[PDB]
Design an enzyme around this catalytic site. Sequence first.
Site, mmCIF file in Angstrom:
data_model
loop_
_atom_site.group_PDB
_atom_site.id
_atom_site.type_symbol
_atom_site.label_atom_id
_atom_site.label_comp_id
_atom_site.label_asym_id
_atom_site.label_seq_id
_atom_site.Cartn_x
_atom_site.Cartn_y
_atom_site.Cartn_z
ATOM 1 N N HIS A 18 0.807 -1.215 0.000
ATOM 2 C CA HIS A 18 0.000 0.000 0.000
ATOM 3 C C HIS A 18 0.844 1.271 0.000
ATOM 4 O O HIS A 18 0.305 2.378 -0.003
ATOM 5 C CB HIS A 18 -1.030 0.016 1.156
ATOM 6 C CG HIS A 18 -0.486 0.446 2.484
ATOM 7 N ND1 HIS A 18 -0.165 -0.449 3.484
ATOM 8 C CD2 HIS A 18 -0.286 1.679 3.009
ATOM 9 C CE1 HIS A 18 0.204 0.214 4.566
ATOM 10 N NE2 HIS A 18 0.138 1.508 4.304
ATOM 11 N N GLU A 77 19.726 7.064 7.142
ATOM 12 C CA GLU A 77 19.039 8.231 7.682
ATOM 13 C C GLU A 77 18.780 8.201 9.190
ATOM 14 O O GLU A 77 18.624 7.138 9.789
ATOM 15 C CB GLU A 77 17.681 8.389 6.978
ATOM 16 C CG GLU A 77 17.761 8.890 5.545
ATOM 17 C CD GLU A 77 18.035 10.378 5.490
ATOM 18 O OE1 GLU A 77 18.707 10.863 6.411
ATOM 19 O OE2 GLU A 77 17.598 11.058 4.542
ATOM 20 N N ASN A 107 18.043 11.947 11.069
ATOM 21 C CA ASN A 107 17.230 13.158 10.965
ATOM 22 C C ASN A 107 16.885 13.285 9.485
ATOM 23 O O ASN A 107 17.732 13.671 8.701
ATOM 24 C CB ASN A 107 18.023 14.393 11.394
ATOM 25 C CG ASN A 107 17.172 15.653 11.415
ATOM 26 O OD1 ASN A 107 16.333 15.865 10.545
ATOM 27 N ND2 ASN A 107 17.394 16.498 12.408
ATOM 28 N N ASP A 167 0.028 -7.545 1.956
ATOM 29 C CA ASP A 167 0.531 -6.173 1.910
ATOM 30 C C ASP A 167 2.057 -6.167 1.983
ATOM 31 O O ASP A 167 2.652 -5.841 3.014
ATOM 32 C CB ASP A 167 -0.072 -5.372 3.063
ATOM 33 C CG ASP A 167 0.212 -3.887 2.963
ATOM 34 O OD1 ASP A 167 0.547 -3.401 1.862
ATOM 35 O OD2 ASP A 167 0.083 -3.200 3.997
ATOM 36 N N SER A 174 2.659 1.457 16.441
ATOM 37 C CA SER A 174 3.244 2.077 15.258
ATOM 38 C C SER A 174 2.087 2.940 14.755
ATOM 39 O O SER A 174 0.987 2.851 15.295
ATOM 40 C CB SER A 174 3.670 1.025 14.223
ATOM 41 O OG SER A 174 2.614 0.145 13.885
ATOM 42 N N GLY A 205 5.199 0.119 6.048
ATOM 43 C CA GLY A 205 6.261 -0.411 5.219
ATOM 44 C C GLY A 205 7.513 -0.672 6.030
ATOM 45 O O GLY A 205 8.443 -1.309 5.540
#
Length: 223
Positions: free
Chosen positions: A40, A52, A54, A84, A172, A178
């Site tokens: 999705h 990554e 920040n 999904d 979450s 994802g």
Amino acid sequence: IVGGYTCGANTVPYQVSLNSGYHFCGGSLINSQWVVSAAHCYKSGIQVRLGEDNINVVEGNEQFISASKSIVHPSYNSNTLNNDIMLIKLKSAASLNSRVASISLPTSCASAGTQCLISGWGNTKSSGTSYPDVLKCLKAPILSDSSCKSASSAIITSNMFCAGYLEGGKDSCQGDSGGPVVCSGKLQGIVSWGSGCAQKNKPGVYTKVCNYVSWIKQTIASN
Ligand SMILES: [Ca+2]
């Protein structure tokens, strides 16, 4: 992530941020050229951002790589969110190091009670919206199937599992989708959906990765 804590710069080396002019989903690096995320989260023009912390400032350690192709599971159903899961191939191989590493796929499914680490740059509030700059972390246990099915409004398929706290307060949320759910060093889940965020008796629902190992391998091998 609601009710979590600041992970710390690069402590979750496999965490990825999907970007299209802004952060819209998370993902997990499974090898130098492939990322696993949620179906999705599909969109054209995706840039994968590795190393990554920040996401609003360039700090060093980041690697920006365009997606060459996104493979949504053929049986993905947008109405129930069954299956999904999605695979993204990077246009170029990522440079693996201490701050950018892959996470292993499971050889067997995890059982109820197993503690796991969920992470992402998603909403941190149960009510209202507030997106963090740095990566957030949350340790949560996988719930039993009976509790999962009794608390979920929508249908929970065998390709999903619940994780979190029934008392609410930790979960979450939007933007974490994802993202990874790692237990015992293996990628067991993908942030998929939930009813609101960190609500009482409404645990998060995740894609059960152990049911897709064969598919992942076969797809990567033929692309
Ligand atoms: Ca950055």
